[PDB]
Ligand binder design. Structure first.
Ligand code: A2G
Ligand code: A2G
Ligand code: A2G
Ligand code: ZN
Lengths: 342, 11
């Protein structure tokens, strides 16, 4: 009744705080989950993320992103949905296990590339898990969702794998996708591990209703319909990707920097093609060279905040050091004179 | 009642 699962597994993944892979759908049977990221199976902060064809066979069906983290093993504190995008909905799941999921309506398209990048980080004694998606054709990043997990010092510790799964039982319907550009950032040294070599493996060694292979460009895999394995129970394949990933640049324009009636307003906009914002800080100096100590500091500007409005007492001539950093820890600093009129 | 389970850890 069900298409067999297919797993694509890096040979060399390690404990990571950033995990990234590129995915392209080819055939999209309904009730298919491409979980392109998986971590900590059976463990603290177990989770996954990817793409679902929830209904229909094509773009006119319900196409989504998915993100889930299982409830803490010991802590009684709830996982919080800290941030959901305009098309994202956070809900608690149940059945044999419980936790938090974010489902995001997202009009992804056949034969287009989608880069799903997850980051885990420590903030206020908790671990945050964030989901970002680059639409490669549009050259546009979007922040999808951030979960606040009430246990410190958890990360994408083990179990990196992708799966394609039929969750309803329509093994007659073929599902096929491609992946490339798998990378993790190591907890050990903050350097990148390249998943250049991956195994493609059917879930059931006795079920051959799936197939896989690689071009010089991508790994591909399918299951269901007339799929029949050309690679036995599984096979390993190498892509010629660079050992360090090609990371774009953080690029933004300051839109306002003015002080009026004891209120400081500073706003910015990342360029359409920029890497996405991870955090911000603004130091305010009483001198152009920004020597000595700032007279004031605005800390803990979040990934989802593109400005500040603060009641503050300043002298005549103030200068703002705007320090933004992207999800890849690239920092871009601008120095702007604060204007004393809106 | 849809479920989307995951692989078990290695023993
Ligand atoms: C897995 O996907 C299905 C299909 O959409 C359901 O949303 C289910 O609740 C999901 N399970 C988890 C843990 O997110
Ligand atoms: C999850 O577990 C169920 C059994 O409980 C099925 O094996 C299902 O195929 C599994 N899904 C994946 C992706 O491994
Ligand atoms: C599969 O992995 C998820 C996290 O991705 C959960 O840890 C889930 O409980 C795991 N399933 C099994 C059978 O261990
Ligand atoms: Zn807490």
């Amino acid at each position: 009744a069900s298409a067999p699962g297919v797993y694509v597994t890096p040979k060399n993944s390690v404990s990571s705080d950033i995990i990234s892979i590129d995915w392209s759908p080819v055939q999209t049977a309904p009730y298919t989950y491409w979980a392109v990221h998986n971590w900590n199976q059976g463990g603290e902060a177990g989770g996954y993320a990817g793409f679902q064809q929830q209904s229909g066979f094509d773009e006119n069906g319900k196409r989504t992103l998915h993100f889930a983290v299982w409830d803490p093993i010991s802590s009684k504190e709830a996982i919080k949905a800290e941030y959901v995008s305009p098309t994202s909905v956070a809900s608690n799941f149940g059945g044999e296990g419980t936790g938090l999921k974010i489902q995001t309506t997202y009009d992804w398209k056949n034969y287009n590339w989608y880069r799903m990048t997850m980051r885990s980080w420590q903030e206020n004694g908790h671990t945050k898990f964030g989901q970002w998606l680059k639409d490669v054709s549009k050259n546009q990043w979007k922040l999808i969702g951030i979960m606040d997990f009430p246990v410190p010092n958890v990360t994408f510790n083990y179990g990196q794998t992708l799966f394609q799964a039929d969750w309803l039982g329509n093994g007659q319907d073929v599902r096929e996708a491609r992946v490339k550009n798998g990378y993790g950032r190591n907890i050990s040294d903050k350097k990148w591990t390249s998943w250049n070599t991956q195994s493609i493996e059917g879930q059931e060694p006795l079920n051959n209703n799936w197939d896989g292979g690689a071009t010089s460009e991508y790994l591909w895999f399918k299951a269901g319909g007339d799929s029949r394995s050309t690679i036995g129970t599984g096979k390993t394949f190498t892509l010629n990707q660079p050992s360090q990933p090609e990371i774009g640049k953080l690029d933004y324009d300051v839109k306002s920097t003015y002080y009026e009636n004891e209120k400081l307003n500073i706003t910015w906009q990342l360029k359409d093609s920029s890497t996405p914002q991870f955090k911000g800080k603004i130091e305010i100096y009483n001198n152009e060279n920004m020597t000595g100590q700032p007279i004031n500091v605005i800390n803990d500007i979040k990934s989802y905040q593109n400005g500040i409005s603060q009641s503050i007492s300043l002298p005549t001539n103030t200068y703002a050091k705007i320090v933004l950093t992207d999800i890849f820890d690239q920092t871009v600093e601008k120095k702007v004179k604060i204007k004393n009129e809106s | 009642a849809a479920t989307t389970t995951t692989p078990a850890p290695a023993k």
